[PDB]
Symmetry: C3
Subunit: 304 residues, 3 copies
């Protein structure tokens, strides 16, 4: 693997390889002894747009591997208004570092960068169209907590129309077997039809549901995403929507599923669900570190 | 010690333990050989409010111990306006790191955080009510330079009414023996009465003084704090105040005391005092590193 | 060498020493094995003004040497409006760190700092009058790519009147032998006369040229700098200027010279020159790391 630009670039087997590697990274972390796997290696964080979350996780992952990190987070005026084009910055930075995590608004930005970069490019959103690492950690969470990915019944709740990370996860799962999908959302925010077509073609068993109550307790994974306010300018109607799709304790009690949420969690899930056994989004967050560790390590070693 | 939230949580003995540990850290630094005490450990700097000073010192302390540091300084809009509540951020970050230094405006913020954190919380101001580490380094300075803390005559000059760090130091000293306190300030900015009550109860010998000249040369330590402009909107009157309480060379010459100042120094002390023997605030600054080292180390090791 | 404040402070021999040291650093980098030369040492980046470029390179250099880095980039209001004077910050930071890279707008800022600093000061622009490290890496590039510095024919294109880095390089080269200089620029932006005097005095063979076509193919090095818009408010005339001095592929083909550019490259050089053999500015960028490594190492070791 030369770069990690989009989930579209890797198959089931290669995904499972990355997951195995992540399980190993997790054990290493459990060791509490200093790891030197990437000692002497430098990760360059290159963000034209902000993402404290993305930066922290990758920075943690790299440092857990004994590696170093240089950071470049503002380029909305630090070089985009300073003149330097993307391809110039990439070239300068691939000369400094050993690997780059890039978050750039322009479409195909990460792909172009990989073309001019002498080091591996990791795409952390362009500007948030394809986020492979988020999708990999989601899959990792499922494997860890459920045992394996094939044969799961997963339900997605929230804005399925603009949920980029849902989109990415949905596609990735279509590469697996016997996966039943449930798409719960406001009628206004249903999964993009083109995707629906992809699922139908791949002959995936799926359902579009209007309500959370339309779900039986056969679902193995509840993956909840955000429903932003920009979708309902009227505070009154927005109350309605939030109320209908907010995950609450009473609805969770005695359920089989685990609950996943890419974070941050704002309104989607009540605070008194956090302490329920099925709540796993914070554990999910942690899993993000071992899989980013595997990703970092793999890209370094695959290319030298 | 699980966390370090407030000086109110530790007694004389435990303070002295921390100080001994700091003396050891200082020797280690004097060695100029790479220290690995916290190799493989990650410190997370979590500030909703800015504090370049706080961040640098802790970051230096952690790195001197061979440890790593991840930084999160803006949360006034990076997650407070991004939606994520404090308790969520703490949970995500305690999953990434091994220890956290937190500076959050809300009262009892650090305490709440420690409740949701799986790792030790260090309170670097909430929003600047209790700063244990500053108070510990102040005490360390006194022990190092004076020999011991008991039996000192210390005078505080400046705004004693809003001097949070004076407040914290004053309380901590009340735990020691034979400590005589002198409180020099504008009548408008005298030490809060409730504190005065605490001192009277603890039967501490203390004096409220109007002028610097009311001090004899029996004082062992001169601890000076800031008198902000917000206290005297009239530039004319503010001239008067500054002039009356500014420490000047001629007043310092031949004095027994050392001069402590938490920094930054703006108007409180003339520049031509810096080079006088009794000037110790810059040495005080350095001492901040060894005691933060001890603090970091202790909290890691006490909890694993 | 106690500090590195200005090129005016070091002679040919000492420059060559630093260059040799840089060649060694470059080999070490080529090794791809973790270097520990500055393990346990802390570099403090102190910028009152912004310079993502400067910071990254030095930070990379220090980390390549196994060292650590603390960063302080905003002081336009973080301590300049927070009260603390430069000399105070320097003293606090020289207590924390082992070496400082300083970028401060005020003239003679770096020099003053070195006076109050207990650790070596590296001047990264004050506010951009003397940048020794840029000038050292430029010289390094020439030695590496040309073989040696003496006897080269170098042409400078762009704004020669406000090109601080050209000024610095020109002076440094005057310390070498048989160096022929060609100064290509708009008549409005010719090399400052006082410098011309220095060259005449040192009896350097040089020419002031109006056009790129006035250059023969005997030039060994083409060093191009920026011509900002502030020099030609009329977009119309600015078109003219840019067009006349922009380096283009057809002009470069079959040329003997290498092309150097301190970066960032905005308008000065066409993108389809990048891939021509004579294009070396990105390699030049990389060379910046080994020479900053040598600089960092030398200053640490010369002072302990
Ligand atoms: K490090």
């Amino acid at each position: 693997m030369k770069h990690l630009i989009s989930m579209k670039d890797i198959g089931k087997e290669e995904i499972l390889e990355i997951l195995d590697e992540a399980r190993k990274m997790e054990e290493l972390l459990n060791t509490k002894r200093p790891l030197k796997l990437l000692e002497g290696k430098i990760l360059a964080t290159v963000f034209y747009e902000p993402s404290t979350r993305t930066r922290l996780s990758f920075e943690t992952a790299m440092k857990r591997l004994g590696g170093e990190v240089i950071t470049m987070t503002d380029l909305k005026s630090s070089s985009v208004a300073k003149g330097e084009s993307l391809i110039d910055t990439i070239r300068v930075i691939s000369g400094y570092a050993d690997i780059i995590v890039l978050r750039h608004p322009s479409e195909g930005a990460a792909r172009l960068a990989s073309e001019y970069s002498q080091v591996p490019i990791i795409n952390a959103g362009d500007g948030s169209n394809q986020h492979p690492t988020q999708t990999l950690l989601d899959l990792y969470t499922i494997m860890r907590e459920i045992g394996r990915i094939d044969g799961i019944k997963i339900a997605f709740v929230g804005d399925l129309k603009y949920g980029r990370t849902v989109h990415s996860l949905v596609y990735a799962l279509s590469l697996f077997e016997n996966v039943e999908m449930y798409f719960v959302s406001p009628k206004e925010l249903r999964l993009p039809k083109d995707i629906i077509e992809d699922l139908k073609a791949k002959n995936i068993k799926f359902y579009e549901k209007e309500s959370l109550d339309d779900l039986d307790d056969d679902i193995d994974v509840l993956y909840v995403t955000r429903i932003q306010k920009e979708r309902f300018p009227d505070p009154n109607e927005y109350e309605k929507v939030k109320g209908s799709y907010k995950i609450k304790r009473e609805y969770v009690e005695g359920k089989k599923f685990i609950i996943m949420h890419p974070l941050p969690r704002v309104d989607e899930i009540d605070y008194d669900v956090d302490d329920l056994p099925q709540a796993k989004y914070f554990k999910q967050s942690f899993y993000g570190i071992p899989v980013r560790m595997a990703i970092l390590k793999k890209l370094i070693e695959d290319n030298e």
